[PDB]
Amino acid sequence: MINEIEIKRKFGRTLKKIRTQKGVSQEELADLAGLHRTYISEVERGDRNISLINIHKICAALDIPASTFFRKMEEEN
Amino acid sequence: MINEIEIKRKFGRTLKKIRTQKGVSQEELADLAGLHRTYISEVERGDRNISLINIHKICAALDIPASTFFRKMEE
Known part of the structure; x- marks a missing residue:
């Protein structure tokens, strides 16, 4: 059975991990991607x-291919 | 920065290619993924x-990791 909440939260955990590894703030990522910081945080x-x-x-803003993003998501415990 | 129409079209082409490679019709993919056929077509x-x-x-319905799907899309 699909757990929509877990899928979304796993994506978000992975984004936070990759962004923080790359030394990018939420506001910086928002600016680079043309999105609201509140939305990045959400x-x-x-x-x-x-x-x-x-x-x-x-993914473009963080200079990472989507495939690599999803591979990291998949590799999460 | 990405071009939005190109991303949507390239994802759709990649989906058609993988599904067809695997012998899965749009109708069957709709059935397996719990989506409507018209949605798949769109x-x-x-x-x-x-x-x-x-x-x-x-991706689950087609037994392909999303990472692998996107690697194909990125070719």
Whole structure:
């Protein structure tokens, strides 16, 4: 059975980890991706229905391929 | 920075390619992923901005990791 909350929260945990590893603040990431900082923060908590376009804007801003983002998500405990 | 129409169209083309490679019709993918056929068709055409949840469902239905799906999309 699909757990929408866990899927979203796992995405957000992975974003926070990658962003923080890269030394980028939420505000910086928001600016680079053309998104609101409140929205970045919400995504990091799994509050948003993040979709393909914003996934790619965020990954582009962090200079990481989406495949690598999802591989890290998949490798999480 | 990304071009949004290109991303949506490239995802849709990649989905059609993987599904067809695996011998799965749009109707069967809808059945397996718990989505409507029309939605699958729209996604394949690049007319939707597919959600993380539905990416997950489609990839699971096709027995492909999302990372691998996106690696193919990135080719």
